[PDB]
Paper text:
As a sirtuin (SIR2) family protein, defense-associated sirtuin2 (DSR2) has been demonstrated to participate in bacterial anti-phage resistance via depleting nicotinamide adenine dinucleotide (NAD+) of infected cells, which can be activated by tail tube protein (TTP) and inhibited by DSR anti-defense 1 (DSAD1) of diverse phages. To defend phage invasion, Bacillus subtilis utilizes DSR2 proteins to sense and recognize phage SPR tail tube protein (TTP), then unleashes NADase activity of its SIR2 domain to deplete the cell of NAD+ and abort phage propagation during infection. Each DSR2 protomer contains three domains, an N-terminal SIR2 domain (SIR2, residues 1 to 297), a middle connector domain (MID, residues 297 to 627), and a C-terminal sensor domain (CTD, residues 627 to 1005). Structural analyses and biochemical studies reveal that DSR2 forms a tetramer with a SIR2 central core and two distinct conformations.
To elucidate underlying mechanisms, the cryo-EM structure of the DSR2-DSAD1 complex has been determined at 2.98 Å, with DSAD1 bound to DSR2A in the open state. In the structure, DSAD1 consists of strands β1 to β5 and one α helix between β4 and β5. Extensive interactions between DSAD1 and DSR2open consist of residues S18, I53, C57, D58, F59, E76, F79, and F81 of DSAD1 and residues K960, R802, W919, K965, N963, N863, S909, and S908 of DSR2open. In addition, the binding of DSAD1 introduces new contact with DSR2closed by DSAD1 residues K6, Y16, and S18 forming hydrogen bonds with DSR2closed residues S637 and I631 of CTD and residues G572 and Y574 of the MID. Compared to TTP binding of DSR2, the DSAD1 binding induces much slighter conformational change with an RMSD of 1.138 Å between the overall structures of the DSR2-DSAD1 complex and apo DSR2. Although the SIR2 domains within the DSR2-DSAD1 complex exhibit conformational twisting to a certain extent, the magnitude of twist is much smaller compared to the changes induced by TTP binding. This conformational change on the SIR2 domain tetramer is not harsh enough to hurt proper tetramerization conformation critical for its NADase activity. When superimposing TTP and DSAD1 simultaneously in one protomer, DSAD1 binds to DSR2open with the lifting α42 generating a wider binding pocket; the falling of α42 in the closed state clearly blocks the entry of DSAD1 like a door bolt. With the direct steric hindrance in the binding site occupied by DSAD1, it is impossible for TTP to bind to the same DSR2 protomer. The binding of DSAD1 locks DSR2open in the resting state, by not only competitively occupying the binding pocket but also stabilizing the MID of the adjacent protomer to stop the transduction of TTP-induced conformational changes in DSR2closed, allosterically inhibiting the activation on DSR2 NADase activity triggered by TTP binding.
Author numbering:
A (entry chain C): 6 to 120
B (entry chain A), C (entry chain B): 336 to 1005
Write the structure that this text describes.
């Protein structure tokens, strides 16, 4: 690739997920557009479940520093992702680093282990 | 340098070109009648030496050494954290100038650094004419070390502001800050030893190191002979105790603590002394883990009847609580097995934990606190209630810890998610009896009663919320009714909309008349209401009226399937709900038979509902990194998918070396 | 403390508020127009500063820092092991006092400690007129360290004596040892920096650290922190895609080697400095294994596709050889896979290994009596020829590496068992040339010429003997007969008993005419000859004449096993015959059903003879890495064995750090 920032970009191999401090401007299927989104994923394999829970990871969606209350089916199309520490506009890169991961949310901001 | 006084209490000749007097002195101590031949004045000088060497633990010679136990006792109220007895001591009338020396250290340990600066400045005035400079020289060291504490606090108070300390100011007046800067201008601690009287420098040359910038430089380099020269010691084999490099490093830790706490030196609160305790306790646990695993290769797995070689006690508990951060305890928990470290003296570890619970109660069930005491104490109260996983607690002692952890521990340090992580750790060696459930059931009520405000949301950095406390109650007492939560949900209307959404997560805790009226706001009509109804809503059931909407969304996706291929759109960026449905089928919670007639849409769906008719060259091996202990056990249940995914795990543990694919393959698939 | 000077050539300003005088200094470096405003008495004070930092490595500030290209060159003959250049440098004529400081370090490195103490002694007479004192203070340190080096020898030459080198030998005369304890027994190394002028203090304040361990203290603290965060990024599965997180450990390493070898300090021969180097490079290889077996599963890295890897240069081969023991390399070879780390500059690892093979024949062929030099050199020559498995060698360089290994390594260190081990290692990367079989043949005819005594027998500690040199020849030269040993086994009388046992071990290496000459002399009359007879292709199947000799051995064992119960001890042979028997019975090589009556003597015998009724509390997991391909795949077939050597082998995957237990588990059992 080109001369990107790529300095806090780490790859967690335990839950197949990139971690670097970016912000999202996502748009759903037909619901609305949101500003300054970021994800936080938490790896909790020892968890008191229901009779329907199946995942080791759980995702909190954050919208402005406050938690998004999910009310719809969550389609994400990253209209514009932007880097925060270096202010570059990392938009097309996070598109093509996402199909070759084949996980639900490939880029997050932090990953918490065993909660 | 005439003798070695080794850490066992024994004496070895080193360079005594002269008369052997320490060899002779213990010949007087052994005999009872030969010492009744000495002088008059020079016989009470024997009782004073016999008390000194017994109090400091110099026992006998090393050529005539016995088999005697040398246990550690630190007699200090500031080591044990007896904060309320330290405060009763500060409010008593000082007889001596040695009692003001001990008060000035207890003031520093209690965080009130202004009173301690002034009380050391008082002692220096009253102790120049003293004929020994120990109260004078050490008050000049401790006054300068507590000046380094004030200057580094007023930096970090203005680095955080109000978001961390919670007081929105700094606890030092400028009449105190600009005073002590004038009093400490060009105060060189180096010229302190070389500017004291000549009789001080001969008599007390051993106190010279406290004026240095960094001591403990020799003890850190002696940690190299601890953990990683036993690479070569196991070629011939290392053993148990025997004053091995294990015991020498541990007893020199216990001498450096007992020196610095019984002589009330404030250099015991610095980063260089905290890193020394970290670097030397972490490296004694890595050594005992190494010697355990090598003794399972050469000897057998049952030849070591003990759990592990490193046996902790009360003083090892307090040194990890006071000196380690939580990112440093987590390094021990991966680089050892503290389930294999047996903790002794658990009636003393309990009396230390109840006592941290008493101080967290007193600091924050009150309008009175320091921000200087709170910054150093809350790192120890966090590390001690975190490390209490490994301790059996009594029922009346655990109940005082759970009340201080759930109600009185400040949210600036432990949010709602980190309290659950540390409450769940207390239920491993213990469990939840019927008395500790009633504290959580008073926590959910106090969190229910706070969510009636329209501008309140829980802030949690782990992803764990009030949902998860309720899952912990039901994991132990499967039949439980919260009579105060089941009296706030049927005294409930649509006037408060947020508390409707709070108590959606707490449905298996409520009663039948409660679940009657709280299900009066659950409108499941679209499949958008299905998934949060099953994930978040806790429906805990599958009616055919539930599954009928699933078939409809399946069939419309099958209606979308004929335009899935004719339009060329194949991207599902979490547009699925579909890998989720086959997992519900495979777990035997969807009792349809007509599901398998829809198995052509998603590859992950095609695996869970049609195992036998599946093309395993379409398997994405990363799917097993999203499946939990529940679902991975069921894939080792199915006789059709067991032998296939072993070959996809073996091609990922041979080609890469991923320690998660190996952890799956061993704990479930063999 | 006005500017942090990091180990990457950057400068970070901390603890300064006045004029920034290093910022203005690098503005002078980049531009030429800011020069010529310099006074001529100040401009000549610039080319010395500009040459000071281009020699040392302070390139720029932190802000204007671009590339971090930094190579390394330790220009010192002692780092490179040029021994025959040092001998020609001491025989050369003295020129200055700086050329004698660089001289006395070279005699110390050559084990001439009697003459190097005398040479440092002359510098102390002369260096006061030098008006600098740095040659004086560093010679006072270095002479005191040579003194402390000749005290640990005389408490180990006169202490151990017999097992080290022959008998009680004296490298130092009784006059010298008595006299140096007189000239320097009032010396205190703690007051060497204080007993010097105040012009030498505050202009050489960075040299008070050389009196003690506190020149290693800032690097030991940074090892112990950067270890803990590499281990915790490895127990997390995290892969940073930028600069390496232990590039600090590499650059801070090579500063300590370029400080101490260039400035000619004898602190390079410490234990505490040797222990810093191996803990630094164990971390660099444990992370290098972690990073070459990574998996992104994204068709390679897009932006990080041009990432370079850790590879062994020349300076890394020398730092493992001087500073590791063999047990330090044994751990690093079972935790990591050095055979997949690629090694560079193979052309100048030649001259280090040819140079070691030439300095070991220049003192174990002629009168090489310097057992002082033998004390630390032979631990380097052992660790270098052991770690030479991984380098590719030329045939003229391999030949003198092998001829020095077999003939001129002393048997006090490297007996005949671990002399075979370090020969089979050198054949892995180097397929064995024809001029090296001629070196083994000159070694097998020599051991035969030593067996003409009836009192000479081979002593090993591995169980490997002079047979195994002959299977190694018959591994690469399947049709090869000797012409010189066959000229010895043609002359065989009855009075040559130890000769004829020896050549019956080496029977497939002897000629077709002479194999008939010895086998018609003596034949199988023992079970010690049966073990010999199987492996040399003489007994293709067990006849009943041999099995009765086996049970006669097992009975006389059992009668000895009865009387063993009263003495209550357990003593085995060098080669354990009992475990070989059970492997033959388990592989259906012996058809006898009478050996179940012997179960209860040795634990490995009971596993193979009775796989059904064995107590698996006493199964040693080290047994599994002694077995070949066939025996291990037959333990995987026995249903009485398979599901119990999984739980032995699962717990050694997750608890040990050996990589063999995976390869046994995956290739055979899963």
């Amino acid at each position: 690739k080109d001369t990107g920032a790529t300095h806090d970009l780490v790859y967690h191999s335990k839950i197949n997920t990139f971690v670097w401090d970016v912000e999202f401007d996502i748009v759903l299927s037909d619901s609305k557009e949101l500003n300054k989104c970021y994800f936080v994923k938490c790896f909790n394999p020892y968890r008191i479940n229901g009779k329907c829970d199946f995942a080791v990871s759980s995702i909190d969606i954050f919208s402005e520093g406050k938690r998004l209350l999910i009310e719809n089916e969550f389609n994400f199309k990253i209209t514009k992702a932007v880097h925060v520490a270096t202010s570059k506009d990392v938009t097309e890169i996070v598109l093509h680093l996402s199909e070759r991961i084949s996980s639900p949310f490939p880029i997050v901001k932090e990953v918490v282990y065993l909660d | 340098y005439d003798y070695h006084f080794e850490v066992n209490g024994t004496v070895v000749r080193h360079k005594n070109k002269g008369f052997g007097y320490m060899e002779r002195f213990f010949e007087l101590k052994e005999s009872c009648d030969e010492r009744s031949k000495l002088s008059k004045k020079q016989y009470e000088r024997f009782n004073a030496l016999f008390n000194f060497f017994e109090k400091n633990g110099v026992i006998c010679m090393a050529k005539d050494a016995g088999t005697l136990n040398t246990s550690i006792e630190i007699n200090s109220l500031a080591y044990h954290g007896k904060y309320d007895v330290m405060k009763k001591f500060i409010e008593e009338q000082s007889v001596s100038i040695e009692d003001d020396y001990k008060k000035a250290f207890f003031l520093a340990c209690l965080g009130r650094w202004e009173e301690s600066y002034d009380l050391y400045s008082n002692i220096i005035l009253n102790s120049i004419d003293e004929s020994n400079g120990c109260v004078y020289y050490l008050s000049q060291i401790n006054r300068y070390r507590i000046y380094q504490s004030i200057t580094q606090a007023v930096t970090q108070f203005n680095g955080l502001g109000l978001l961390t300390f919670g007081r929105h100011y700094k606890p030092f007046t400028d009449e105190f800050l600009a005073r002590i800067e004038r009093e400490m201008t060009n105060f060189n601690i180096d010229d302190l030893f070389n500017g004291m009287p000549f009789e001080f420098q001969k008599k007390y040359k051993i106190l010279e190191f406290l004026s240095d910038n960094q001591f403990l430089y020799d003890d850190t380099v002696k940690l190299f002979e601890l953990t990683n020269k036993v690479r070569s010691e196991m070629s011939e084999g290392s053993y148990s105790f025997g004053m091995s490099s294990d015991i020498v490093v541990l007893l020199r830790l216990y001498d450096n603590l007992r020196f610095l706490y019984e002589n009330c030196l404030w250099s015991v609160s610095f980063h260089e002394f905290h890193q020394y305790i970290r670097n030397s306790m972490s490296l004694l646990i890595e050594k005992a883990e190494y010697e355990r695993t090598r003794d399972i290769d050469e000897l057998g797995f049952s030849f070591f009847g003990k759990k592990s070689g490193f046996f902790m006690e009360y003083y090892d508990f307090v040194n990890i609580s006071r000196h380690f951060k939580i990112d440093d305890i987590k390094n021990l928990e991966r680089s050892c097995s503290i389930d294999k470290i047996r903790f002794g003296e658990q009636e003393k570890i309990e009396e230390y934990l109840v006592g941290i619970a008493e101080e967290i109660t007193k600091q924050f069930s009150a309008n009175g606190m320091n921000v200087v005491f709170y910054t150093q104490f809350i790192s120890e109260a966090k590390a001690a209630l975190y490390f209490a996983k490994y301790v059996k607690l009594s029922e009346e002692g655990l109940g005082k810890i759970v009340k201080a952890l759930l109600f009185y521990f400040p949210e600036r340090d432990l949010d709602i998610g980190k309290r659950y992580v540390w409450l769940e750790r207390l239920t491993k060696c213990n469990e939840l009896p019927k008395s500790i459930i009633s504290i959580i059931d008073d926590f959910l009520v106090l969190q229910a009663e706070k969510h009636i405000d329209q501008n309140y949301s829980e802030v949690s950095s782990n992803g764990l919320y009030s949902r998860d406390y309720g899952a912990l109650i039901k994991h132990f007492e499967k039949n439980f009714i919260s009579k105060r939560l089941s009296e706030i949900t049927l005294c409930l209307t649509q006037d408060k909309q947020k508390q409707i959404d709070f108590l959606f997560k707490l449905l298996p805790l409520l009663s039948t008349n409660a679940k009657s009226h709280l299900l009066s706001f659950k409108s499941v009509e679209n499949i958008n209401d299905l998934m949060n109804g099953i994930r978040i809503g806790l429906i805990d059931e599958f009616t055919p009226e539930h599954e009928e909407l699933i078939i409809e969304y399946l069939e419309t996706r099958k209606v979308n399937y004929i335009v899935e291929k004719e339009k060329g759109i194949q991207t599902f960026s979490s547009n699925d709900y579909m890998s989720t449905f086959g997992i519900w089928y495979f777990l035997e919670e969807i009792n349809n038979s007509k599901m398998e007639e829809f198995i052509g849409m998603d590859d992950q769906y095609d695996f869970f509902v049609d195992p036998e008719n599946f093309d395993y060259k379409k398997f994405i091996p990363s799917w097993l990194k999203n499946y939990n202990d529940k679902l991975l056990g069921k894939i080792a249940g199915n006789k059709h998918m067991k032998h296939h995914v072993i070959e996809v795990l073996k091609e990922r543990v041979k080609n890469s070396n991923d320690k998660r694919y190996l952890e799956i393959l061993m704990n479930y698939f063999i």
